[PDB]
Amino acid sequence: IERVSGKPLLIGTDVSLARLQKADVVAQSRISFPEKELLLLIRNHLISKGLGETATVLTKEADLPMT
Amino acid sequence: IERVSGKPLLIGTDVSLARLQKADVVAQSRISFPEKELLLLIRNHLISKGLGETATVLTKEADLPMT
């Protein structure tokens, strides 16, 4: 099944063949993302876990849309 | 197949039945994690993405094992 399809490196998963060339595209895609969506996730984690005395410090490095 | 097994809420995935009670355990498990492994992942991301002038600021909130 590996030979007549897109050659996975002997990983045993999703042995159907229509589900094997789905795994050709989803794996080799080029995912990129903006950094701004992640920096708000950092600040939303610090305030919730007790140590929120650097949320005001993060005004300097980048923007602060929410308080 | 839903009725003789652990009743997923009509989500069409992994239609084999041995692969259906694997999904009973992996989903309903109680995953917990220490916060310390995540706070080093925050600091290792800030230094790499150009804005590393709060890595020394993170000495105050928690420990700084690596520079």
UniProtKB/Swiss-Prot annotation, chains A, B:
Stretches that traverse the bilayer: none
Induction entry: Up-regulated in a number of cancer cell lines (at protein level).
Function field: Acts both as a substrate recognition component of E3 ubiquitin-protein ligase complexes and as an atypical serine/threonine-protein kinase, playing key roles in various processes such as cell cycle, telomerase regulation and histone modification. Probable substrate-specific adapter of a DCX (DDB1-CUL4-X-box) E3 ubiquitin-protein ligase complex, named CUL4A-RBX1-DDB1-DCAF1/VPRBP complex, which mediates ubiquitination and proteasome-dependent degradation of proteins such as NF2.
Phosphoserine PTM sites in chain numbering: 16
Part of the full-length chain shown: 813 to 879 of 1507
Organism: Homo sapiens
Protein known as: DDB1- and CUL4-associated factor 1
Domain of life, per lineage: Eukaryota
Family classification: Belongs to the VPRBP/DCAF1 family.
Oligomeric and partner information: Component of the DCX (DDB1-CUL4-X-box) E3 ubiquitin-protein ligase complex, named CUL4A-RBX1-DDB1-DCAF1/VPRBP complex. Interacts with DDB1; the interaction is direct. Also forms a ternary complex with DDA1 and DDB1. Interacts with NF2 (via FERM domain). Component of the EDVP complex, a E3 ligase complex containing DYRK2, EDD/UBR5, DDB1 and DCAF1. Interacts with DYRK2; the interaction is direct. Interacts with RAG1; the interaction is direct. Interacts with LLGL1 and LLGL2. Interacts with histone H3.
Domain note: The protein kinase-like region mediates the threonine-protein kinase activity. The DWD boxes are required for interaction with DDB1.
